RNA sequence: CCCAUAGUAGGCCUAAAAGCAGCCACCAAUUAAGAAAGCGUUCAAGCUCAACACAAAAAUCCCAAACAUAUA
RNA sequence: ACCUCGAUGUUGGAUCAGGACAUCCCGAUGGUGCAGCCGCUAUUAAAGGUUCGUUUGUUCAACGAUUAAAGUCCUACGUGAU
């Protein structure tokens, strides 16, 4: 994993999944596991873009995805 | 079972069995303490009877035997007789039981009863059964005519298994099964020690006569408050290992064992097998003597005889560190013989000197080498040494990135270190 | 002296006269030591049985080891073994007189408290080792608080009141309906079918 | 296989006996008759 | 009262610890 | 169609058919499934044999009995046939067999949450 | 990683207490003790000073230091060298509330130690609890 | 066999029938009843006082930080007059409608931590957040005027 | 695997699963905790 | 399921024993945390909890066949 | 003390063995204080196998030499109209 970016509009509803995903991914344990991995939790529908160490991109549109599903896909793509 | 015991002490005068070191009063006091140990009964009567032929079947002479049986039968309150004669032979036990009308116990049987009643171990139960196998004259106090003629007579031309044939078969089968079970328990006890041997913990066996303070000394050495010494004879039933730290910062196992007794077949007591094999496999032997006790010489002789009969290694017999405990009881005591550490277990007087002495003894015996070794930092060499060898001292060279560690290390650990971190 | 007191194997003055094994002392509900006294928790005997010195030692050692002396105290609610039980020599043929006194026991009837605990503690702190002791007791036993005991008694009363069965053991036995007293025992008129020998059926109404 | 020691129905280890719904109904019927008997004897 | 509920929480923790001593 | 019989419960694995060849060690205990796979007629044959009276007419009755694993029947037997008895158990319908009319008739019992992955 | 030590300002001696632990994570112990002695010169001498060293993955030092300890500081204020054994009944020195306030004035000022509670009550209560745990009585 | 036996003695068949007939029958309740129909107020006052006192309010998700990182952020905030606050959502939900904050409902979900102040150091706070590329600034409402992040940035500039 | 009539989780990692008709205590960190009903 | 800062490495004790070897105190701050309810450490370091937030087995060979739903 | 005293011949051995598994060996499997070799323990498995000698009437026991092992039992302590 190289970089992770999470974008959402909090004033717009249906953002709980992406917000919880941000909290879990930014949890200090993950960032300590990969300090080199860089998180950019921008904010401005909600989307998550993950660029891996192999230059592979995963895009999860968390409008109708639960945090568990998003995290499972993220971990599966980490495993590759 | 709320028994009443007559303590009959054969005072051997002249010839073999004459005890120069100890006195009849001391021996009968020892027997009284022994019987009190069992929590079930006490001495109601005590008789010290002079005897000049202790090796004969009846121990006593004709007149003395008649006199004894006269009192034993006249006094009804007695339930059994304790004969302070070490071990009785089967014929002697049979004759005495028939004459006196009550069960007769010797030191061997009484100690077996101590083990069975106090330490309710399968070893003790099986040993009691083994010793109890000889079984005849069930109805004591009376000679019963039987007239066993016509039982199992020939039906056509032969007879089935007769009595004294069935008894023999049952005796043989029971002996075989008891021996096999005892062997299994011995194998399990050996299994318990495999991890300790592999880890190569220096193991020290504390041996000595009963009430010499082996348990108290181990408590003082290790610092464990759980250890509970008692004034009772044979208080430290069962063998247990306790960890302790020496001045060289080494970890050493003290094997608290069952105290030894004078005039007792320790090799034939099964409950003593754990103690005997643990002293056999011990790296060092700590001989604790209660110099305060008047019978100190006899106690030392008995323990030394048992150790010699164990056929232990000559180096194990040698370097056996002798510790004179209960020194505080003696107001002013000076150890005439050299290489003996006088200590007070309760008061902890000579414990530091003892610790240094048997630390040197362990270093000599276990073969561990004290040496200074250079280890590169961040290698984890230092952590590996911390785990696998005692570390007397560490001095790190800040500039070089190495450390000189004074460590006591065994040959196995040294070879492992050299291979793992060349 | 909060810790549980030591119990002797046999009375200091041993009994000399052998006495019959009156099993009625085990049979039926307990009429003594049925209520709490200077305590809030106890071991209730849901069945009849004889307690030996071995059982007493088990209870004493376990409770003493597992309790907190500075905050908990325990007390026996059953007397030390007094009833003598006699055993003949192994392999003896029948007859020849009554055997010699072998051991001493103490009878316990269903519904009795064996040990009672109290102090600055709640149920959950004590129920563990009390249940261990109860399970190791010779009869069915249960660690019960005052509240739990009252709850179970009230539940039994509620079941007796609201049972939809038109027929009850009490009614049939008392009225001798079907002549069942030919099969029943005179004790059953008071046991109401809830007791069978030394066994107490709690679900029985 | 499946032996009852000694004789059935007498020893300490007897053959288990189980009440059927038929037997329960019969006993209940008899109990009802006897309850009516109690009523008619109570006057 | 913040101190009131702080003391209540402390007492609840004490009770839980006492209950869990055996557990 | 004796091959297509259905056992209630786990009888296929729990019901054991036992026999003894007579020779020592000749006790054979074969589960219902194994016996069915071996002989597609043994299950029904044994059931009928057990239900028949235990006398000397049982073997004649079994001779009168005819069993066939599948739909095929001999032509002579088919010509002999007179009546067809109703099947003792009505076969429940599968979802694939349920008509759309029945599905529509059966009401929906609950509103699943819209945002559920199912 | 973060390494915590209670080294005494004057006692910067490399080796027994610091050598092995620091080396396990990888250090230049000479540099570490040199910087610690620089801090010792900057501050009073002969007093324990908690440290918060952070061994960066790049193998560099960032020594962070602050006020001396609380236990030794209270003992010095009360004129005690060795603390009480019981600490619940044994008492070796007494400190006034004014002295407690004065010492607290220069206490809640360290970034690492987290003592930044604006209210004086928080810090005074904490140090009062520390003294009560120690063998020091609270006067008036 | 004695009346009292160590085992459960076999009952006479008539006694067995009597027991089975006199077994307990629970009452069947026709239709199953199963399918028939200080600190809180202390923090209420605390939230009311916070809202009344603070002129500017922001919220964030300071839950991904370490203990020491959160402490450092708190120290940097306290360098200014701004105060960081933690309160439960379970009791924060009523406060929005109580204080007439309708637009604030879809902002406080999950971990939410307040940044109440009167003098905005938002410029330096955003600078501090910049070196940590996470923990996004979440929408707030200064002086009863909801501001988005673009509004906060414009106000900062 | 040890046969026990009463199954107890001997650590946090032990878990109960009903397999092949009986209960099992399975454990990966401490395989010696493996119990079978 | 999440999460754990802390006056400090509470004192004495010890070669060091730092929540976690022993005894006594056992408070107190942070919105929220027992000078720590369990592992681990040579000692540390590191991992968790409470607290914030969110039944059974024997010896010739098992032993009726089977059956869950048509109105007592 | 329930059948058998107008007889149910009853130790050990030979011969032939049928059966159980609570397995001694061979098979599979989990744990281990399982580094390997030996082991120990538990689950499953009874298809097959489970030695020869000295003394002793011995069944057994000890001892000698082996073996993969030299199993525990039931069968009227199997089997004398063999
Ligand atoms: N005065 C004095 N009494 C001592 C001393 N050591 C032991 N004792 C006493 O002797 C008792 C011996 O008890 P243990 O140490 O348990 O006995 P042991 O040496 O294990 O011997 P056994 O009980 O036979 O196994 C102690 O409980 C004290 O009563 C000592 O140094 N001085
Ligand atoms: Mg004659
Ligand atoms: Mg019969
Ligand atoms: Mg937690
Ligand atoms: Mg007869
Ligand atoms: Mg008779
Ligand atoms: Mg005849
Ligand atoms: Mg098997
Ligand atoms: Mg026989
Ligand atoms: Zn486990």
Helical segments of C99-145, H only: 123-136
Instruction: Report how far residue D33's alpha carbon sits from residue H27's, in angstroms, rounded to the nearest whole number.
Output: 25
Bases of strand K lying below 7 A from some protein CB: 1, 7, 9-12, 17-20, 30-35, 39-43, 47-48, 57-62, 77, 80
Q: How was this structure determined?
A: cryo-EM
Say whether the C–H interface has 3 or more Cβ pairs within 8 Å: yes
> Considering only CA atoms, which of F35, F54, F55, F57 is closest in space to residue F45?
F35
Q: How far is CA F33 from the centre of its chain?
A: 11
- What angle is formed at CA B305 by the lines to CA B301 and CA B310, rounded to 5 degrees? 150
* Contact between D31 and C175 using a beta-carbon 8 Å cutoff: no
Domains and CATH numbers, chain F: 1-118 (3.90.1180.10)
Q: Which residues contact G126 (CB under 8 A, 6 or more apart)?
A: G115
Shortest alpha-carbon distance between residue H85 and chain E (Å): 15
- Cβ atoms within 10 Å, residue B9: 20
Q: Is B139 known to sit in a ligand binding site?
A: no
Residue B235 CB–ligand 1 contact under 6 Å: yes
Instruction: Report how far residue B381's alpha carbon sits from residue E6's, in angstroms, rounded to the nearest whole number.
Output: 49
Which two structure tokens, joined as six digits, stand for C166? 């038109």
> Considering only CA atoms, which of C154, C156, C147, C165 is closest in space to residue C194?
C156
Sign of CA dihedral H98, H101, H102, H106: negative
Whole-Å CA distances, G137 to B326, C157, G76, G124, G134: 45, 61, 14, 14, 8
B387 Cα–ligand 10 center, Å: 26
Is G98 in the same domain as G115? yes
Are the C-beta atoms of C42 and C115 separated by less than 8 Å? yes
Total of domains in chain A: 1
Whole-Å CA distances, B287 to B232, B363, D13, F61, G12: 20, 18, 61, 94, 48
I32 CA to K37 C1', in Å? 24
Instruction: Report how far residue B375's alpha carbon sits from residue B400's, in angstroms, rounded to the nearest whole number.
Output: 11
Residue G124 structural domain: 67-140
Residue C166 structural domain: 1-205
Q: Is B69 known to sit in a ligand binding site?
A: no
* Contact between H103 and A11 using a beta-carbon 8 Å cutoff: yes
Are the C-beta atoms of B254 and B242 separated by less than 8 Å? yes
**Region of D6 on the Ramachandran plot (φ > 0 left; ψ -120 to 50 alpha; else beta):** left
- What angle is formed at CA B119 by the lines to CA C74 and CA B94, rounded to 5 degrees? 130
Q: Domain holding A6: CATH number?
A: 3.40.30.10
The full length of chain H comes to: 157
Shortest alpha-carbon distance between residue D33 and chain C (Å): 10
Residue found under tokens 């995963």 = A58
Cβ-Cβ contacts under 8 Å, A31 against chain H: 64
> Considering only CA atoms, which of B12, B98, B97, B105 is closest in space to residue B51?
B12
Q: Which residues contact C117 (CB under 8 A, 6 or more apart)?
A: C39, C40, C41, C42, C63, C67, C72, C73, C74, C75, C126, C130
Sheet holding B103-106, edge to edge: B42-51, B4-12, B80-83, B103-106
Instruction: Report how far residue A53's alpha carbon sits from residue B149's, in angstroms, rounded to the nearest whole number.
Output: 102
Total of domains in chain C: 1
Whole-Å CA distances, B148 to B74, B144, B152, G73: 32, 12, 10, 98
Ligand 1, atom nearest to B257 Cα: 25
Exposed, middle or buried, G44 (CB in 10 Å: 0-12/13-18/19+)?
exposed
The dihedral formed by the CA atoms of A10, A16, A22 and A28, expressed in degrees to the nearest 10:
120
Instruction: Report how far residue B67's alpha carbon sits from residue B149's, in angstroms, rounded to the nearest whole number.
Output: 36
I13 beta carbon to strand K: under 7 Å:
no
Sheet holding B369-376, edge to edge: B369-376, B402-409, B390-397
Fold assignment, H1-157: Alpha-Beta Plaits (3.30.70)
* Contact between H107 and A22 using a beta-carbon 8 Å cutoff: no
Q: Domain holding G111: CATH number?
A: 1.10.10.250
Q: Which residue is nearest to nucleotide J32 (CA to C1')?
A: H86
> Considering only CA atoms, which of C130, H94, H147 is closest in space to residue E22?
C130
Instruction: Report how far residue C63's alpha carbon sits from residue C77's, in angstroms, rounded to the nearest whole number.
Output: 14
Q: How far is CA B48 from the centre of its chain?
A: 27
For chain I, list the contacting chains (3+ Cβ pairs, <8 Å): none
* Contact between B396 and G24 using a beta-carbon 8 Å cutoff: no
Resolution (A): 2.6
Which of the 8 DSSP states describes residue A10? T
Total of domains in chain G: 2
Instruction: Report how far residue B104's alpha carbon sits from residue B108's, in angstroms, rounded to the nearest whole number.
Output: 11
Radius of gyration (C-alpha) of chain B in whole angstroms: 27
Which two structure tokens, joined as six digits, stand for B351? 């414990």
Q: Domain holding G48: CATH number?
A: 3.30.1550.10
Is G55 in the same domain as G73? no
Q: Which residues contact B108 (CB under 8 A, 6 or more apart)?
A: B86, B87, B88, B131, B264, B265, B268, B269
Is G55 in the same domain as G8? yes
Is G5 in the same domain as G74? no
Q: Which residue of F has its CA nearest to A63?
A: F115
């Amino acid at each position: 994993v190289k970089q992770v970016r999470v974008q959402f509009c909090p004033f717009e509803k249906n953002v709980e999944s992406t917000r919880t995903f941000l909290q879990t991914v930014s949890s200090e344990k993950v960032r300590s596991t990969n300090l080199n991995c860089s998180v950019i939790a921008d904010v401005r529908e909600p989307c998550v873009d993950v660029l891996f160490g192999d230059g592979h991109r995963l895009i999860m549109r968390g409008a109708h995805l639960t945090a568990l599903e998003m995290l499972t896909a993220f971990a599966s793509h980490i495993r590759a | 079972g709320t028994q009443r015991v007559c303590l009959v002490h054969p005072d051997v005068k002249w010839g073999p069995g004459k005890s120069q070191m100890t006195r009849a009063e001391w021996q009968v006091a020892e027997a009284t303490a022994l019987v009190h140990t069992l929590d079930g009964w006490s001495v109601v009567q005590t008789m010290v009877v002079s005897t000049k032929t202790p090796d004969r079947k009846l121990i006593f002479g004709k007149g003395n035997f008649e006199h004894l049986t006269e009192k034993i039968r006249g006094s009804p309150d007695i339930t059994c007789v304790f004969l302070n004669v070490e071990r009785m032979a089967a014929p002697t036990k049979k004759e005495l039981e028939a004459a006196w009308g009550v069960e007769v116990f010797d030191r061997f049987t009484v100690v077996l009863h101590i083990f069975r009643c106090n330490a309710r171990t399968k070893e003790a139960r099986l040993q009691v059964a083994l010793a109890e196998m000889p079984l005849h004259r069930s109805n004591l106090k009376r000679d019963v005519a039987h007239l066993y003629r016509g039982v199992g007579s020939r039906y056509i031309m032969g007879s089935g298994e007769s009595f004294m044939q069935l008894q023999q078969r049952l005796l043989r089968e029971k002996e075989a099964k008891i021996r096999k079970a005892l062997d299994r328990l011995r194998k399990k006890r050996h299994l318990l020690r495999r991890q300790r041997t592999r880890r190569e913990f220096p193991v020290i066996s504390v041996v000595g006569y009963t009430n010499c303070g082996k348990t108290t000394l181990i408590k003082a050495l290790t610092g464990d408050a759980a250890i509970q010494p008692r004034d009772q004879l044979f208080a430290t039933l069962d063998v247990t290992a306790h960890a302790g730290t020496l001045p060289s910062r080494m970890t050493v196992l003290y094997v608290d064992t069952i105290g030894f007794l004078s005039q007792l077949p320790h090799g034939l007591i099964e409950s003593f097998s754990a103690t005997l094999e643990d002293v056999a496999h011990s790296d060092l032997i700590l001989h604790v003597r209660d110099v305060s006790h008047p019978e100190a010489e006899l106690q030392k002789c008995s323990v030394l005889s048992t150790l010699r009969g164990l056929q232990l290694p000559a180096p194990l017999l040698d370097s056996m560190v002798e510790v004179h405990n209960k020194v505080d009881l003696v107001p002013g005591y000076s150890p005439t013989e050299p290489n003996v550490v006088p200590v007070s277990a309760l008061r902890g007087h000579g414990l530091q000197e003892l610790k240094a002495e048997l630390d040197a003894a362990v270093l000599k015996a276990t073969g561990r080498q004290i040496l200074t070794l250079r280890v590169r930092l961040a290698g984890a060499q230092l952590s590996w040494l911390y785990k696998e060898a005692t570390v007397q001292e560490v001095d790190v060279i800040p500039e070089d990135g190495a450390a000189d560690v004074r460590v006591i290390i065994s040959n196995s650990a040294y070879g492992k270190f050299r291979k793992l971190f060349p | 002296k909060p810790k549980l007191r030591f119990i002797e194997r046999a009375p200091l003055v041993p009994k000399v006269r052998r006495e019959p094994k009156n099993l009625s002392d085990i049979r039926g509900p307990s009429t003594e030591a049925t209520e709490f006294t200077e305590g809030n928790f106890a071991i209730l005997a849901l069945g009849g049985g004889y307690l030996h010195w071995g059982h007493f030692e088990m209870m004493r050692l376990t409770i003493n080891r597992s309790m907190d002396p500075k905050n908990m105290f325990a007390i026996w609610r059953v007397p030390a073994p007094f009833k003598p039980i006699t055993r003949k020599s192994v392999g003896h043929r029948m007859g020849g007189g009554k055997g010699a006194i072998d051991h001493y026991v103490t009878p316990v009837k269903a519904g009795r408290l064996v040990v009672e605990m109290g102090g600055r503690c709640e149920f959950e702190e004590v129920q563990g080792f009390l249940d261990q002791v109860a399970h190791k007791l010779p009869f069915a036993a249960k660690a019960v608080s005052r509240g739990t005991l009252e709850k179970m008694r009230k539940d039994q009363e509620e079941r007796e009141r609201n049972n939809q069965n038109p027929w009850t053991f009490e009614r049939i036995a008392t009225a001798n309906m079907l002549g069942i007293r030919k099969v029943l025992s005179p004790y059953d008129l008071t046991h109401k079918g809830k007791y069978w020998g030394k066994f107490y059926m709690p679900k029985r109404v | 296989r499946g032996r009852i020691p000694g004789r059935q129905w007498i020893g300490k280890h007897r053959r288990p006996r189980f009440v059927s719904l038929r037997a329960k109904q019969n006993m209940i019927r008899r109990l009802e008759i006897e309850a009516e008997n109690h009523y008619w004897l109570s006057m | 009262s913040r101190e009131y509920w702080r003391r209540l929480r402390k007492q609840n923790i004490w009770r839980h610890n006492r209950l869990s001593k055996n557990k | 169609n004796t091959r297509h019989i259905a056992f209630s419960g786990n009888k296929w694995e729990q019901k054991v058919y036992s026999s003894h060849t007579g020779y020592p060690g000749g006790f054979r205990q074969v589960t219902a499934a194994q016996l069915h796979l071996r002989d597609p007629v043994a299950i029904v044959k044994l059931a009928i044999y057990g239900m028949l009276p235990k006398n000397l007419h049982r073997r004649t009755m079994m001779e009168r009995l005819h069993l066939f694993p599948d739909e095929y029947i001999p032509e002579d037997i088919l010509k002999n046939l007179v009546e067809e008895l109703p099947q003792p158990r009505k076969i429940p319908k599968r979802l694939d067999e349920y008509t759309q009319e029945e599905i529509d008739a059966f009401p929906r019992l609950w509103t699943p949450p819209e945002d559920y992955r199912l | 990683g973060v390494i915590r030590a209670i080294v005494r300002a004057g006692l910067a001696m490399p080796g027994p207490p610091l050598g092995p632990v620091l080396g396990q994570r990888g250090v230049s112990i000479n540099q570490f003790c040199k910087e610690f002695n620089e801090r010792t010169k900057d501050i009073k001498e002969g007093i324990p000073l908690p440290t918060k060293i952070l061994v960066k993955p790049d193998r560099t030092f960032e020594i962070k230091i602050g006020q001396p300890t609380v236990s030794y500081f209270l003992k010095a204020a009360a004129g005690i060298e060795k603390g009480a054994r019981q600490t619940g009944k044994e008492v070796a020195g007494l400190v006034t509330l004014k002295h407690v306030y004065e010492i607290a004035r220069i206490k809640a000022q360290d970034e690492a130690f987290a003592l930044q509670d604006v209210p004086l009550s928080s810090v005074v209560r904490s140090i009062i609890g520390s003294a009560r745990s120690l063998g020091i009585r609270v006067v008036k | 066999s004695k009346a009292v036996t160590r085992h459960r003695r076999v009952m006479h068949f008539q006694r067995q029938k009597l027991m089975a007939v006199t077994e307990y029958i629970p009452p069947k309740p026709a239709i199953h009843p199963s399918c028939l129909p200080g600190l809180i107020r202390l923090l209420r006052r605390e939230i009311a006082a916070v809202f009344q006192d603070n002129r500017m309010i922001a919220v964030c998700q300071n839950v991904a930080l370490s203990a020491e990182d959160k402490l450092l952020m708190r120290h940097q905030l306290r360098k200014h007059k701004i105060l960081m606050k933690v309160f439960p959502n379970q009791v924060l939900k009523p406060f929005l409608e109580d204080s007439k904050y309708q637009n604030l409902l879809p902002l406080f979900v999950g971990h939410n931590m307040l940044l109440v102040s009167e003098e905005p150091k938002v410029k330096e706070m955003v600078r501090i957040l910049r070196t940590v590329p996470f923990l996004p600034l979440l929408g707030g409402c200064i002086d009863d005027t909801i501001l988005s992040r673009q509004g906060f940035i414009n106000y900062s500039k | 695997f040890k046969n026990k009539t009463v199954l107890k989780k001997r650590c946090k990692d032990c878990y109960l699963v009903k397999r092949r008709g009986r209960w099992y205590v399975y454990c990966k960190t401490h395989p010696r905790h493996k119990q079978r009903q």
